[PDB]
């Protein structure tokens, strides 16, 4: 489908077209300012992914466990009976905590790898 | 700690907060020009890391040996008895050589991997 065609699709189906939305983020002083701001926001999202250990990835698995209090729904209800727009609302109050946990777990992983490589 | 809080910390302690400084690099024609220049410099640093084989990493180990003439201090003096501000001065005359060596070793690694993958 096309840009945002999956907006009404379930999460487990909508994830099939992540590339379609990813490619549409980069594609008269006010307009130049808007373009510079769009570039800065793109780079902020790429930096945020980079500091989590997710570089050239659209789907990236991490080692942060789900704490249940964020959302205690069954896995099949989240992926088969929900859209991404609804999910973005259910956990809108927990994204800062998750982001902090991801940053800390990446710092621990990078330090452990640096030490592991030293074993001659 | 906060932004640059580790500036007076030792290198082996200051390295614990690299994320804190990394996140503060992206966060009226003169101001727009300053913003564009800041974006270009950020991208130049990311490209420089990319050509060394260090993409989504804050700490990245390489295969370039230390030549001693750059600095002949004991490892424990550098990491426990020095700050990053002092270290940046001790080897300020050798960073171009190190960068060239890193670029060459990455070129050799990429070519060797390309040939290694060809062994059916």
């Amino acid at each position, epitope marked *: 489908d096309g840009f945002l065609g999956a907006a009404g699709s379930t999460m487990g189906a909508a994830s099939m077209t992540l590339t379609v939305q990813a490619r549409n983020l980069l594609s008269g002083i006010k307009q130049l300012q808007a373009r510079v701001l769009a570039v800065e926001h793109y780079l902020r999202d790429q930096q945020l992914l980079g500091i989590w250990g997710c570089s050239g990835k659209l789907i990236c698995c991490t080692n942060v466990p789900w704490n249940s209090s964020w959302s205690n729904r069954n896995l099949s209800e989240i992926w088969d009976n929900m859209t991404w727009l609804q999910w973005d609302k259910e956990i809108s109050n927990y994204t800062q905590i998750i982001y902090g946990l991801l940053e800390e777990s990446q710092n621990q992983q990078e330090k452990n790898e640096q030490d592991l490589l*030293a074993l*001659d | 700690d906060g932004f640059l809080g580790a500036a007076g910390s030792t290198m082996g302690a200051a390295s614990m907060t690299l994320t804190v400084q990394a996140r503060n690099l992206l966060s009226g024609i003169k101001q727009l020009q300053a913003r564009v220049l800041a974006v270009e410099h950020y991208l130049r640093d990311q490209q420089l890391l990319g050509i060394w084989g260090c993409s989504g990493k804050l700490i990245c180990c390489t295969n370039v040996p230390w030549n001693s003439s750059w600095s002949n201090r004991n*490892l*424990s003096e550098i*990491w426990d008895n020095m700050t990053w501000l002092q270290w940046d001065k001790e080897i300020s005359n050798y960073t171009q050589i190190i960068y060239g060596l890193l670029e060459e070793s990455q070129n050799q690694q990429e070519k060797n991997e390309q040939d290694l993958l060809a062994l059916d």
Partner: antibody
Amino acid sequence: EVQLVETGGGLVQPGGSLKLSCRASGYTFSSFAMSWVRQAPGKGLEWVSLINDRGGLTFYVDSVKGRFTISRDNSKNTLSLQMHSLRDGDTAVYYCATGGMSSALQSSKYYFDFWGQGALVTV
Amino acid sequence: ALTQPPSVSGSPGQSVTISCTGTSSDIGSYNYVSWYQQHPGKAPKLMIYDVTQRPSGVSDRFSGSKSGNTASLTISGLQADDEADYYCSAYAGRQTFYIFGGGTRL
């Protein structure tokens, strides 16, 4: 001034479990990797397990990879080892030792620097 | 494991060497061959670390060397208080961290 004090168990039968613990003093606990070394009553020394200074990287001798868990608490200055199954061949003195690894920014070790006196574990 | 003589001895005032042998993948690859002195009834203490380096506080009579796949601990100026079970150990890579030999009774 460096001291490692074992506070282990006694006799268990095969299929059970026993937890050993060591207390450290005289040095910064979090600055050194620590390990366990086993000595059967009539044999020489062998390495059993190694834990790094942060308690994030653990290594085991093949004979115990599926049986022993090594952990540490850097706020308590406590090292502990949870041993399962404990077969007849595991009767030995278990010593805590400081050394055996260095976390990349420290000089090389690859040796056991300090030793405790050892807990006696029997089966 | 490394191979060591089962017993090395001599009279006080003399000197001995205690050998330690292995293979080319461990003792002959990594220059981390340490020696321990275990008095009967006591835990071992470190005598030599690295290959030829001595810890501070240990008498200058204990020294050593390595060549090929053979390491040697040299004990000069033998005293009556040096009777102990001596052990060698070495680093053997990331899979097998440390390998110990058998004890040598002085």
